[PDB]
Amino acid sequence: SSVVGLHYKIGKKIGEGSFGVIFEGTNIINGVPVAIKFEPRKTEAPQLRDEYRTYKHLQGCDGIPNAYYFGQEGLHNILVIDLLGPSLEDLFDWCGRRFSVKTVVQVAIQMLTLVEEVHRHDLIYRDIKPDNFLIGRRGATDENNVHLIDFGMAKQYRDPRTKQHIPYREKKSLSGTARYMSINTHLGREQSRRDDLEALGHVFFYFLRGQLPWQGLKAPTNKQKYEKIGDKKRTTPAVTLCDGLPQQFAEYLDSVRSLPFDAEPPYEEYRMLLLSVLDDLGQACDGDMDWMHLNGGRGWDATINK
Numbered sequence: 001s002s003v004v005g006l007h008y009k010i011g012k013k014i015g016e017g018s019f020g021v022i023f024e025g026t027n028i029i030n031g032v033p034v035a036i037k038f039e040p041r042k043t044e045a046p047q048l049r050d051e052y053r054t055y056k057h058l059q060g061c062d063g064i065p066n067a068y069y070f071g072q073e074g075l076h077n078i079l080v081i082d083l084l085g086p087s088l089e090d091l092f093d094w095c096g097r098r099f100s101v102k103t104v105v106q107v108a109i110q111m112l113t114l115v116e117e118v119h120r121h122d123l124i125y126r127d128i129k130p131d132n133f134l135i136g137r138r139g140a141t142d143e144n145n146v147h148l149i150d151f152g153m154a155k156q157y158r159d160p161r162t163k164q165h166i167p168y169r170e171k172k173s174l175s176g177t178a179r180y181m182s183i184n185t186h187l188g189r190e191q192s193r194r195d196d197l198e199a200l201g202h203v204f205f206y207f208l209r210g211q212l213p214w215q216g217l218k219a220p221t222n223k224q225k226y227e228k229i230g231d232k233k234r235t236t237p238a239v240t241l242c243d244g245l246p247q248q249f250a251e252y253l254d255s256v257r258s259l260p261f262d263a264e265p266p267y268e269e270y271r272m273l274l275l276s277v278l279d280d281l282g283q284a285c286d287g288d289m290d291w292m293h294l295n296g297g298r299g300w301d302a303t304i305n306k
């Protein structure tokens, strides 16, 4: 039927997830807009059900959408969650592939808070990239706030009751996105909370610079290319990444790269560190974001941008 999960009318296709595609849709009881992701039920790698459990585990966290429904529909499983807006990668593109210092600080502290909340619920995220952080919808209270989706790579890093941390191990697969992943991930080491925060540091520099110096590397195989990228990360000092930029961002990357494997990161310290950038620069943390000035002040538009 045109309606799935009893209550959700399917609309146009808005994206593609890992395995199936993503549609927008409407709750036919209240009109609330939703995103609906499909996954072939007889598929080699199952993740949608785990994503639902993660969303329910995270229910109530600011910036994490509600999950309303999971179930089997024909040959597929579906997951229905709140509908969101463009990703930070989309908006970065539309803004000319550079964000102002102010926008980067402001998104950075929201991203730190989001990852902190994931960590507080005993999970590491393991797939940090601008494409998985989405803003809200036009006209909504959370229109320009940062949200986090796609929990397919998330994993428990500690026991929920005892808080015993998982053991360090090596020889893990290079699952993740090479542009942003931590050095430890390149080396096949078990990921922990520090690796999510290091990937954030890479993303911050990407937004500030417009690129990272390990983009555009070539090699005959994906494995060798990931290795050259890891090699460049290991040999590029954070103050070199930070040339001409507020040095708080170098201090941040160096600090999170230094964290012990099982250590609890000082999240609020990091947020205060990046906030001091705005103090230095005589700026306010007032919510004004670069993408809000697109298209004459209208914001991003499906015709000119998307």
Ligand SMILES: c1ccc(-c2n[nH]cc2-c2ccnc3ccccc23)nc1
Pocket: 014, 015, 017, 022, 035, 036, 037, 079, 080, 081, 082, 083, 084, 085, 134, 149, 150
């Ligand atoms: C259920 C439904 C969607 C998703 C989802 N995965 N990746 C992006 C979205 C998404 C989530 C929310 N709004 C969006 C809007 C456009 C494109 C993707 C999304 N996950 C589970």
Ligand SMILES: [Cl-]
Pocket: 155
């Ligand atoms: Cl694993």
Ligand SMILES: [Cl-]
Pocket: 214, 215, 216, 217
């Ligand atoms: Cl590249």
